[PDB]
């Protein structure tokens, strides 16, 4: 696990992710903290979201545990930060890098999926009253994502 | 009326109807030597109605080579008489008897007849009777490193289950007018041509819902065809299909007819020319015995081999066999005629016992009809095997010396093995080692470790443990039992109660591991297997791995500097469902069972842990307020479980259970249907509640309903257990208390600054001070599947079935709920016997120190279909480092406890490589991209000092080495892989 | 060339291949028909486990040959 984790870390160093920045906590390779910037064409524009990544002892043969730390008002992200992403539960394969996961999370942020939601109330607001959803997401990103 | 407290793991393999039919069948076993006693033991553990033994031959010393129910005090006594006493203790529901005289007409009392150690004329006489009276007949034979099985279940045998798999089922997306059934998105049906399926809940084609099975014509991994459904309708939408398994008729031939034209089962496709040779060879053995007053050829005797080969030629000519006889192989069969190996006995006994169960239950596909096996690659080549060394010495190892010799016996007696695990495979392995004479010499030793204790369900396949042993340590009992079997093992077995893992490296350290000869894994999880594999790789010890599941099993061997390790390959991982599916949109009973388990944890475990940690840690709230995802949830849990909803009696527990019923089965469903009404549509105009999403409906509490009452009882009982109150089971109190309940009104909510911190503070200070509560704790509920009086499986079953009723899913029972929630692994005694036999056949290869990789075999088998297969191990990959050949697995660098700068300089000067990353354990000791100040601080430190500083944890006194991972780049910048570093402290 | 693959659970699979196909192509075909990733497949022919990077002709696999698809188990 250590070899592949260091390969991914070096590759992140070798290529500026621009929209993201992940790295180990202190000196522990099995606990990363990553940052995601809210897309400009999104209600979360100008927001910094922190994620915690926990690599299992069996990496890359088990998915990393990725959880949002910043509060976000999204149909597919609940109050605990759990992310409704398929590549993190049962579609994980030992060929996906952390950069791919971060790109997937950014794509999830730029457009939600209310037809298979994790938070039914936010999904209902999104489907019926879009403007209220926009205002709520803007308020949440101004209150929690900016500080 | 099956005792599920004993047959728990076996019922998940066979079933209830199978075992009910099995408990009405009589089994006669002729012959009470190692093979016969193995078969009888497995049959007694399986649970047949009764077992009768017939063996009036007085005991001989050599019989102790594989008969573990015989002692040296039993010489001269008939084997059945001395074996029945010890067989009668294995299972209390299976009587075991002995008959001193066998007549043909007496055979009609038995469902199955097993024949061992019998001449061919007697076998023909018995089979001529059993064939015309429709009695299952099995004949087994074990000659040295050779084995044979023959099955004859009658001309009209009926097999109800052929492969032992669960019926296939799946959700349909559409059915066209021509029967083209299509699965959902990216879903595989898994059917094969000729299978039968039945449909339910098919909209637009009600005719398919009648329940008539239909033929399947597979057209791809996602679609199949059923024929013409023109009359039933034009097109069908949604629905589910379930496979229908149809009985088969199998016709067997008698032994007399089967001798002339046999039908072979091939255990290995690498040697497909041999079974025809063994067919002639075993008949020649019978003829030789008949011509010499029942005496087999003497070990490694050339005159007897010549006479035996003449018999083989005569038989091959008589049977019109058009096969050219391989003289070397046939004479090898002659040489090892008197061999009696406990490994071959275990392997064949497991196979034959499974065949007996097939005969008595009409389940799984039986062998058709001859099964000839050999393990001739196990014959030693590093010692002298001749007539002088293989002659009997009048000891209990004569049956093994007749195959391997006395020098190999001296090699075996000096082994220093390490057995990890003492379960079923561990018990079988210990018994095999005791019979083989392992570690009975002056320099031999056995170490066995296991941290578990004996339970009732373990007695069904771990034959070394008795009901009186329940509650004791597995390793101590196993060591005592095997010391009883072989008295020479007294004082040469050491038992530990330690779990093998990172926390036990002070006991199983360098000194412990450097004296071993081999390690055998008998575990049930992959984490421990990987840990032991890494330890064996570091210490360069041979490893024997084995695993079972139901009727399937595998064995692998890891040899230093020759093969790859256990962790070099991948296995399919456990399947976990999406959180969205579990929380809101279940469609299978597995989803609801997972939800029920999470509900159990969230109701009876987590809040209690939070309350207890609040009353212990003085700074719990301050840390939790900033180091938790939902500190508000923790505060609410503490408040509710301490002050707001603390029960002072059991009636308050009943009211709490009623409230939780309303919360989890009536109100959340109403909120969900408020968010997504049943008439809602997706963003593309399709209905929302279609296909994998099933529209739920709220439940109204009715006391007369069984599931509602079960949930209330279990929830109230578990709450009382949490608060230490006295629960009750009489329905009268429940009906009295619940009658006067007024549910608070509920209306789903439509939704619509920094003061919340003040609210959290107000909640926190409202809690009673920890100082006022000293010595007060709440008992948490720790999940326990095997106890049927703690209300755990009862609660999980009730919650799962209620949530299934919410979504119109078919509820399950406590049996399946316990299977799913408990993550139980189906287990069988026959599979354990087979894997132990294979492992002990590879062990003698390890002892001989064979170097070539084609001499070792990894084995796989499935006894439900009668499949055996073997393959050579994979050689460890090689690589080029600095123009030198390096093994990628078994090679390492050995360096002193130098400084980081000196290590980097050594790698630069010696290997010509530039170090870029250096890590130890779970820490990054050095990286090329770190700031110059940190490096300049960390360079002049020794590796041990650097590790201690970075981990902030001093190395233990017993720690004698460090393992370091290093990533380095060459001069050109190309990344080159290198083996790990072993720093000597 | 047409070959057959038998699973440890009794299922049978038919593959249309050629003698020049690598083991990787066969594993990809098995993944297509079964969904088992190539890195988790253990194929056995005539007592030899097939390894990635070689061809069928390296193992003398011809038409109507039978391979076995096996896996390891975790009980004990
Ligand atoms: P089967 O499930 O019948 O029995 C397995 C036995 O293996 C032991 N075991 C599991 N895991 C470990 C570790 N890490 N160390 C030592 N022993 C282990 C169980 O206790 C069963 O006896
Ligand atoms: Mg146990
Ligand atoms: Mg277990």
mmCIF file of N, CA and C in Angstrom, chain B residues 38-143:
data_model
loop_
_atom_site.group_PDB
_atom_site.id
_atom_site.type_symbol
_atom_site.label_atom_id
_atom_site.label_comp_id
_atom_site.label_asym_id
_atom_site.label_seq_id
_atom_site.Cartn_x
_atom_site.Cartn_y
_atom_site.Cartn_z
ATOM 1 N N UNK B 38 -12.452 -43.139 9.324
ATOM 2 C CA UNK B 38 -12.669 -41.776 8.846
ATOM 3 C C UNK B 38 -14.078 -41.617 8.281
ATOM 4 N N UNK B 39 -14.502 -42.563 7.440
ATOM 5 C CA UNK B 39 -15.846 -42.495 6.870
ATOM 6 C C UNK B 39 -16.892 -42.535 7.975
ATOM 7 N N UNK B 40 -16.721 -43.438 8.943
ATOM 8 C CA UNK B 40 -17.698 -43.566 10.019
ATOM 9 C C UNK B 40 -17.753 -42.305 10.870
ATOM 10 N N UNK B 41 -16.599 -41.692 11.140
ATOM 11 C CA UNK B 41 -16.577 -40.452 11.908
ATOM 12 C C UNK B 41 -17.334 -39.353 11.178
ATOM 13 N N UNK B 42 -17.067 -39.192 9.880
ATOM 14 C CA UNK B 42 -17.747 -38.144 9.128
ATOM 15 C C UNK B 42 -19.247 -38.403 9.052
ATOM 16 N N UNK B 43 -19.647 -39.669 8.935
ATOM 17 C CA UNK B 43 -21.069 -39.995 8.883
ATOM 18 C C UNK B 43 -21.737 -39.733 10.229
ATOM 19 N N UNK B 44 -21.066 -40.079 11.330
ATOM 20 C CA UNK B 44 -21.624 -39.803 12.652
ATOM 21 C C UNK B 44 -21.764 -38.306 12.888
ATOM 22 N N UNK B 45 -20.769 -37.522 12.472
ATOM 23 C CA UNK B 45 -20.879 -36.075 12.620
ATOM 24 C C UNK B 45 -21.960 -35.499 11.716
ATOM 25 N N UNK B 46 -22.188 -36.105 10.548
ATOM 26 C CA UNK B 46 -23.193 -35.580 9.629
ATOM 27 C C UNK B 46 -24.592 -35.661 10.225
ATOM 28 N N UNK B 47 -24.940 -36.793 10.836
ATOM 29 C CA UNK B 47 -26.226 -36.916 11.494
ATOM 30 C C UNK B 47 -27.173 -37.942 10.903
ATOM 31 N N UNK B 48 -26.650 -39.048 10.377
ATOM 32 C CA UNK B 48 -27.498 -40.115 9.854
ATOM 33 C C UNK B 48 -28.212 -40.785 11.021
ATOM 34 N N UNK B 49 -29.190 -41.641 10.720
ATOM 35 C CA UNK B 49 -29.987 -42.247 11.782
ATOM 36 C C UNK B 49 -29.130 -43.117 12.690
ATOM 37 N N UNK B 50 -28.322 -43.998 12.107
ATOM 38 C CA UNK B 50 -27.464 -44.874 12.891
ATOM 39 C C UNK B 50 -26.353 -45.401 11.996
ATOM 40 N N UNK B 51 -25.328 -45.961 12.634
ATOM 41 C CA UNK B 51 -24.183 -46.546 11.947
ATOM 42 C C UNK B 51 -23.937 -47.929 12.530
ATOM 43 N N UNK B 52 -23.708 -48.908 11.660
ATOM 44 C CA UNK B 52 -23.344 -50.257 12.068
ATOM 45 C C UNK B 52 -21.978 -50.597 11.491
ATOM 46 N N UNK B 53 -21.127 -51.196 12.318
ATOM 47 C CA UNK B 53 -19.768 -51.550 11.939
ATOM 48 C C UNK B 53 -19.628 -53.063 11.868
ATOM 49 N N UNK B 54 -18.842 -53.536 10.903
ATOM 50 C CA UNK B 54 -18.547 -54.959 10.767
ATOM 51 C C UNK B 54 -17.064 -55.114 10.461
ATOM 52 N N UNK B 55 -16.293 -55.551 11.451
ATOM 53 C CA UNK B 55 -14.876 -55.821 11.252
ATOM 54 C C UNK B 55 -14.371 -56.758 12.342
ATOM 55 N N UNK B 56 -14.485 -58.075 12.160
ATOM 56 C CA UNK B 56 -14.064 -59.018 13.199
ATOM 57 C C UNK B 56 -12.575 -59.333 13.211
ATOM 58 N N UNK B 57 -11.751 -58.556 12.523
ATOM 59 C CA UNK B 57 -10.324 -58.850 12.448
ATOM 60 C C UNK B 57 -9.611 -58.302 13.681
ATOM 61 N N UNK B 58 -8.809 -59.108 14.377
ATOM 62 C CA UNK B 58 -8.099 -58.592 15.553
ATOM 63 C C UNK B 58 -7.120 -57.487 15.183
ATOM 64 N N UNK B 59 -6.937 -56.559 16.118
ATOM 65 C CA UNK B 59 -6.090 -55.399 15.880
ATOM 66 C C UNK B 59 -4.624 -55.799 15.769
ATOM 67 N N UNK B 60 -3.924 -55.169 14.831
ATOM 68 C CA UNK B 60 -2.483 -55.288 14.686
ATOM 69 C C UNK B 60 -1.835 -53.940 14.972
ATOM 70 N N UNK B 61 -0.526 -53.968 15.222
ATOM 71 C CA UNK B 61 0.177 -52.739 15.578
ATOM 72 C C UNK B 61 0.198 -51.772 14.399
ATOM 73 N N UNK B 62 0.494 -52.274 13.197
ATOM 74 C CA UNK B 62 0.562 -51.401 12.031
ATOM 75 C C UNK B 62 -0.760 -50.698 11.761
ATOM 76 N N UNK B 63 -1.878 -51.270 12.213
ATOM 77 C CA UNK B 63 -3.168 -50.626 12.017
ATOM 78 C C UNK B 63 -3.217 -49.249 12.658
ATOM 79 N N UNK B 64 -2.353 -48.981 13.637
ATOM 80 C CA UNK B 64 -2.320 -47.672 14.273
ATOM 81 C C UNK B 64 -1.728 -46.591 13.380
ATOM 82 N N UNK B 65 -1.325 -46.918 12.149
ATOM 83 C CA UNK B 65 -0.726 -45.906 11.286
ATOM 84 C C UNK B 65 -1.736 -44.847 10.866
ATOM 85 N N UNK B 66 -3.012 -45.212 10.744
ATOM 86 C CA UNK B 66 -4.045 -44.245 10.402
ATOM 87 C C UNK B 66 -5.324 -44.401 11.213
ATOM 88 N N UNK B 67 -5.412 -45.385 12.103
ATOM 89 C CA UNK B 67 -6.583 -45.574 12.953
ATOM 90 C C UNK B 67 -6.321 -44.881 14.285
ATOM 91 N N UNK B 68 -6.986 -43.750 14.509
ATOM 92 C CA UNK B 68 -6.726 -42.925 15.682
ATOM 93 C C UNK B 68 -7.639 -43.247 16.858
ATOM 94 N N UNK B 69 -8.538 -44.216 16.717
ATOM 95 C CA UNK B 69 -9.331 -44.711 17.833
ATOM 96 C C UNK B 69 -8.775 -46.009 18.400
ATOM 97 N N UNK B 70 -7.604 -46.439 17.941
ATOM 98 C CA UNK B 70 -6.932 -47.624 18.451
ATOM 99 C C UNK B 70 -5.707 -47.211 19.253
ATOM 100 N N UNK B 71 -5.458 -47.923 20.345
ATOM 101 C CA UNK B 71 -4.274 -47.732 21.167
ATOM 102 C C UNK B 71 -3.469 -49.024 21.185
ATOM 103 N N UNK B 72 -2.252 -48.942 21.723
ATOM 104 C CA UNK B 72 -1.394 -50.118 21.767
ATOM 105 C C UNK B 72 -1.855 -51.139 22.796
ATOM 106 N N UNK B 73 -2.826 -50.791 23.637
ATOM 107 C CA UNK B 73 -3.405 -51.731 24.585
ATOM 108 C C UNK B 73 -4.517 -52.571 23.972
ATOM 109 N N UNK B 74 -4.872 -52.323 22.712
ATOM 110 C CA UNK B 74 -5.969 -53.006 22.044
ATOM 111 C C UNK B 74 -5.496 -54.084 21.079
ATOM 112 N N UNK B 75 -4.216 -54.453 21.121
ATOM 113 C CA UNK B 75 -3.696 -55.440 20.183
ATOM 114 C C UNK B 75 -4.347 -56.788 20.458
ATOM 115 N N UNK B 76 -4.840 -57.431 19.402
ATOM 116 C CA UNK B 76 -5.502 -58.712 19.520
ATOM 117 C C UNK B 76 -7.000 -58.649 19.718
ATOM 118 N N UNK B 77 -7.577 -57.456 19.822
ATOM 119 C CA UNK B 77 -9.018 -57.292 20.003
ATOM 120 C C UNK B 77 -9.625 -56.891 18.664
ATOM 121 N N UNK B 78 -10.809 -57.388 18.300
ATOM 122 C CA UNK B 78 -11.402 -56.991 17.018
ATOM 123 C C UNK B 78 -11.565 -55.482 16.922
ATOM 124 N N UNK B 79 -11.300 -54.950 15.728
ATOM 125 C CA UNK B 79 -11.208 -53.502 15.565
ATOM 126 C C UNK B 79 -12.552 -52.820 15.791
ATOM 127 N N UNK B 80 -13.641 -53.430 15.323
ATOM 128 C CA UNK B 80 -14.955 -52.819 15.498
ATOM 129 C C UNK B 80 -15.309 -52.686 16.972
ATOM 130 N N UNK B 81 -14.995 -53.707 17.770
ATOM 131 C CA UNK B 81 -15.348 -53.675 19.185
ATOM 132 C C UNK B 81 -14.645 -52.533 19.904
ATOM 133 N N UNK B 82 -13.371 -52.293 19.582
ATOM 134 C CA UNK B 82 -12.635 -51.213 20.237
ATOM 135 C C UNK B 82 -12.891 -49.856 19.605
ATOM 136 N N UNK B 83 -13.486 -49.811 18.412
ATOM 137 C CA UNK B 83 -13.777 -48.537 17.765
ATOM 138 C C UNK B 83 -15.170 -48.013 18.082
ATOM 139 N N UNK B 84 -16.129 -48.906 18.340
ATOM 140 C CA UNK B 84 -17.510 -48.473 18.538
ATOM 141 C C UNK B 84 -17.623 -47.582 19.767
ATOM 142 N N UNK B 85 -16.868 -47.898 20.821
ATOM 143 C CA UNK B 85 -16.963 -47.122 22.052
ATOM 144 C C UNK B 85 -16.586 -45.667 21.814
ATOM 145 N N UNK B 86 -15.502 -45.432 21.074
ATOM 146 C CA UNK B 86 -15.061 -44.069 20.812
ATOM 147 C C UNK B 86 -15.897 -43.392 19.735
ATOM 148 N N UNK B 87 -16.493 -44.161 18.820
ATOM 149 C CA UNK B 87 -17.363 -43.546 17.821
ATOM 150 C C UNK B 87 -18.700 -43.127 18.416
ATOM 151 N N UNK B 88 -19.170 -43.826 19.449
ATOM 152 C CA UNK B 88 -20.470 -43.514 20.030
ATOM 153 C C UNK B 88 -20.498 -42.166 20.738
ATOM 154 N N UNK B 89 -19.343 -41.538 20.960
ATOM 155 C CA UNK B 89 -19.288 -40.265 21.667
ATOM 156 C C UNK B 89 -19.335 -39.058 20.743
ATOM 157 N N UNK B 90 -19.076 -39.237 19.446
ATOM 158 C CA UNK B 90 -18.986 -38.088 18.550
ATOM 159 C C UNK B 90 -20.308 -37.335 18.477
ATOM 160 N N UNK B 91 -21.417 -38.058 18.349
ATOM 161 C CA UNK B 91 -22.737 -37.451 18.251
ATOM 162 C C UNK B 91 -23.705 -38.274 19.083
ATOM 163 N N UNK B 92 -24.511 -37.595 19.900
ATOM 164 C CA UNK B 92 -25.429 -38.292 20.790
ATOM 165 C C UNK B 92 -26.711 -38.729 20.094
ATOM 166 N N UNK B 93 -27.022 -38.166 18.930
ATOM 167 C CA UNK B 93 -28.225 -38.527 18.194
ATOM 168 C C UNK B 93 -28.013 -39.694 17.240
ATOM 169 N N UNK B 94 -26.788 -40.183 17.106
ATOM 170 C CA UNK B 94 -26.452 -41.244 16.168
ATOM 171 C C UNK B 94 -25.957 -42.446 16.963
ATOM 172 N N UNK B 95 -26.792 -43.464 17.152
ATOM 173 C CA UNK B 95 -26.300 -44.711 17.745
ATOM 174 C C UNK B 95 -25.309 -45.410 16.830
ATOM 175 N N UNK B 96 -24.338 -46.082 17.443
ATOM 176 C CA UNK B 96 -23.332 -46.849 16.720
ATOM 177 C C UNK B 96 -23.315 -48.258 17.293
ATOM 178 N N UNK B 97 -23.365 -49.255 16.414
ATOM 179 C CA UNK B 97 -23.504 -50.651 16.800
ATOM 180 C C UNK B 97 -22.421 -51.478 16.118
ATOM 181 N N UNK B 98 -22.401 -52.769 16.434
ATOM 182 C CA UNK B 98 -21.463 -53.718 15.846
ATOM 183 C C UNK B 98 -22.207 -55.014 15.567
ATOM 184 N N UNK B 99 -21.931 -55.618 14.414
ATOM 185 C CA UNK B 99 -22.462 -56.928 14.058
ATOM 186 C C UNK B 99 -21.292 -57.885 13.893
ATOM 187 N N UNK B 100 -21.357 -59.024 14.580
ATOM 188 C CA UNK B 100 -20.291 -60.012 14.513
ATOM 189 C C UNK B 100 -20.380 -60.896 13.276
ATOM 190 N N UNK B 101 -21.514 -60.899 12.582
ATOM 191 C CA UNK B 101 -21.722 -61.779 11.442
ATOM 192 C C UNK B 101 -22.583 -61.058 10.419
ATOM 193 N N UNK B 102 -22.190 -61.146 9.153
ATOM 194 C CA UNK B 102 -22.900 -60.498 8.061
ATOM 195 C C UNK B 102 -23.487 -61.554 7.135
ATOM 196 N N UNK B 103 -24.780 -61.433 6.856
ATOM 197 C CA UNK B 103 -25.457 -62.250 5.864
ATOM 198 C C UNK B 103 -26.017 -61.342 4.779
ATOM 199 N N UNK B 104 -26.244 -61.921 3.600
ATOM 200 C CA UNK B 104 -26.715 -61.122 2.474
ATOM 201 C C UNK B 104 -28.081 -60.515 2.772
ATOM 202 N N UNK B 105 -29.023 -61.337 3.236
ATOM 203 C CA UNK B 105 -30.373 -60.848 3.488
ATOM 204 C C UNK B 105 -30.401 -59.771 4.563
ATOM 205 N N UNK B 106 -29.388 -59.724 5.427
ATOM 206 C CA UNK B 106 -29.310 -58.697 6.456
ATOM 207 C C UNK B 106 -29.051 -57.312 5.880
ATOM 208 N N UNK B 107 -28.634 -57.218 4.616
ATOM 209 C CA UNK B 107 -28.288 -55.930 4.030
ATOM 210 C C UNK B 107 -29.502 -55.060 3.739
ATOM 211 N N UNK B 108 -30.716 -55.610 3.808
ATOM 212 C CA UNK B 108 -31.902 -54.843 3.455
ATOM 213 C C UNK B 108 -32.282 -53.815 4.512
ATOM 214 N N UNK B 109 -31.624 -53.823 5.668
ATOM 215 C CA UNK B 109 -31.942 -52.898 6.746
ATOM 216 C C UNK B 109 -31.275 -51.541 6.585
ATOM 217 N N UNK B 110 -30.434 -51.358 5.571
ATOM 218 C CA UNK B 110 -29.558 -50.200 5.482
ATOM 219 C C UNK B 110 -29.858 -49.392 4.231
ATOM 220 N N UNK B 111 -29.779 -48.069 4.368
ATOM 221 C CA UNK B 111 -29.928 -47.183 3.223
ATOM 222 C C UNK B 111 -28.666 -47.138 2.374
ATOM 223 N N UNK B 112 -27.489 -47.243 2.991
ATOM 224 C CA UNK B 112 -26.236 -47.220 2.247
ATOM 225 C C UNK B 112 -25.279 -48.258 2.814
ATOM 226 N N UNK B 113 -24.477 -48.852 1.932
ATOM 227 C CA UNK B 113 -23.475 -49.842 2.317
ATOM 228 C C UNK B 113 -22.122 -49.388 1.785
ATOM 229 N N UNK B 114 -21.164 -49.195 2.691
ATOM 230 C CA UNK B 114 -19.802 -48.791 2.361
ATOM 231 C C UNK B 114 -18.885 -49.977 2.619
ATOM 232 N N UNK B 115 -18.005 -50.264 1.664
ATOM 233 C CA UNK B 115 -17.154 -51.449 1.690
ATOM 234 C C UNK B 115 -15.702 -51.007 1.578
ATOM 235 N N UNK B 116 -14.883 -51.415 2.548
ATOM 236 C CA UNK B 116 -13.451 -51.173 2.517
ATOM 237 C C UNK B 116 -12.740 -52.444 2.958
ATOM 238 N N UNK B 117 -11.493 -52.592 2.518
ATOM 239 C CA UNK B 117 -10.649 -53.713 2.935
ATOM 240 C C UNK B 117 -11.322 -55.055 2.648
ATOM 241 N N UNK B 118 -11.928 -55.177 1.470
ATOM 242 C CA UNK B 118 -12.640 -56.385 1.080
ATOM 243 C C UNK B 118 -12.178 -56.828 -0.300
ATOM 244 N N UNK B 119 -12.129 -58.144 -0.495
ATOM 245 C CA UNK B 119 -11.685 -58.700 -1.761
ATOM 246 C C UNK B 119 -12.739 -58.469 -2.841
ATOM 247 N N UNK B 120 -12.329 -58.667 -4.096
ATOM 248 C CA UNK B 120 -13.212 -58.353 -5.212
ATOM 249 C C UNK B 120 -14.360 -59.348 -5.330
ATOM 250 N N UNK B 121 -14.135 -60.615 -4.981
ATOM 251 C CA UNK B 121 -15.224 -61.586 -5.038
ATOM 252 C C UNK B 121 -16.316 -61.247 -4.031
ATOM 253 N N UNK B 122 -15.930 -60.872 -2.811
ATOM 254 C CA UNK B 122 -16.919 -60.470 -1.817
ATOM 255 C C UNK B 122 -17.644 -59.204 -2.247
ATOM 256 N N UNK B 123 -16.920 -58.256 -2.843
ATOM 257 C CA UNK B 123 -17.567 -57.045 -3.334
ATOM 258 C C UNK B 123 -18.580 -57.368 -4.423
ATOM 259 N N UNK B 124 -18.233 -58.279 -5.334
ATOM 260 C CA UNK B 124 -19.183 -58.687 -6.362
ATOM 261 C C UNK B 124 -20.404 -59.351 -5.744
ATOM 262 N N UNK B 125 -20.192 -60.195 -4.732
ATOM 263 C CA UNK B 125 -21.314 -60.858 -4.074
ATOM 264 C C UNK B 125 -22.237 -59.852 -3.397
ATOM 265 N N UNK B 126 -21.667 -58.834 -2.751
ATOM 266 C CA UNK B 126 -22.489 -57.836 -2.069
ATOM 267 C C UNK B 126 -23.223 -56.961 -3.079
ATOM 268 N N UNK B 127 -22.534 -56.545 -4.142
ATOM 269 C CA UNK B 127 -23.148 -55.642 -5.106
ATOM 270 C C UNK B 127 -24.217 -56.341 -5.934
ATOM 271 N N UNK B 128 -24.043 -57.632 -6.232
ATOM 272 C CA UNK B 128 -25.088 -58.359 -6.942
ATOM 273 C C UNK B 128 -26.399 -58.329 -6.174
ATOM 274 N N UNK B 129 -26.332 -58.242 -4.846
ATOM 275 C CA UNK B 129 -27.541 -58.156 -4.039
ATOM 276 C C UNK B 129 -28.041 -56.721 -3.945
ATOM 277 N N UNK B 130 -27.154 -55.783 -3.608
ATOM 278 C CA UNK B 130 -27.600 -54.406 -3.414
ATOM 279 C C UNK B 130 -28.117 -53.778 -4.704
ATOM 280 N N UNK B 131 -27.669 -54.254 -5.869
ATOM 281 C CA UNK B 131 -28.099 -53.633 -7.117
ATOM 282 C C UNK B 131 -29.552 -53.959 -7.434
ATOM 283 N N UNK B 132 -29.956 -55.216 -7.256
ATOM 284 C CA UNK B 132 -31.320 -55.614 -7.575
ATOM 285 C C UNK B 132 -32.315 -55.262 -6.478
ATOM 286 N N UNK B 133 -31.846 -54.899 -5.286
ATOM 287 C CA UNK B 133 -32.715 -54.472 -4.198
ATOM 288 C C UNK B 133 -32.664 -52.966 -3.971
ATOM 289 N N UNK B 134 -31.999 -52.223 -4.855
ATOM 290 C CA UNK B 134 -31.998 -50.763 -4.824
ATOM 291 C C UNK B 134 -31.454 -50.241 -3.493
ATOM 292 N N UNK B 135 -30.203 -50.600 -3.219
ATOM 293 C CA UNK B 135 -29.461 -50.116 -2.063
ATOM 294 C C UNK B 135 -28.186 -49.464 -2.576
ATOM 295 N N UNK B 136 -27.883 -48.273 -2.071
ATOM 296 C CA UNK B 136 -26.687 -47.568 -2.510
ATOM 297 C C UNK B 136 -25.437 -48.292 -2.027
ATOM 298 N N UNK B 137 -24.464 -48.426 -2.926
ATOM 299 C CA UNK B 137 -23.251 -49.190 -2.682
ATOM 300 C C UNK B 137 -22.050 -48.309 -2.985
ATOM 301 N N UNK B 138 -21.154 -48.168 -2.016
ATOM 302 C CA UNK B 138 -19.912 -47.431 -2.201
ATOM 303 C C UNK B 138 -18.771 -48.339 -1.782
ATOM 304 N N UNK B 139 -17.729 -48.405 -2.606
ATOM 305 C CA UNK B 139 -16.552 -49.214 -2.313
ATOM 306 C C UNK B 139 -15.320 -48.334 -2.432
ATOM 307 N N UNK B 140 -14.519 -48.278 -1.372
ATOM 308 C CA UNK B 140 -13.340 -47.424 -1.351
ATOM 309 C C UNK B 140 -12.091 -48.244 -1.061
ATOM 310 N N UNK B 141 -10.952 -47.749 -1.542
ATOM 311 C CA UNK B 141 -9.685 -48.449 -1.390
ATOM 312 C C UNK B 141 -8.556 -47.433 -1.326
ATOM 313 N N UNK B 142 -7.554 -47.721 -0.496
ATOM 314 C CA UNK B 142 -6.424 -46.819 -0.284
ATOM 315 C C UNK B 142 -5.155 -47.655 -0.190
ATOM 316 N N UNK B 143 -4.302 -47.564 -1.206
ATOM 317 C CA UNK B 143 -3.076 -48.355 -1.300
ATOM 318 C C UNK B 143 -1.900 -47.394 -1.438
#
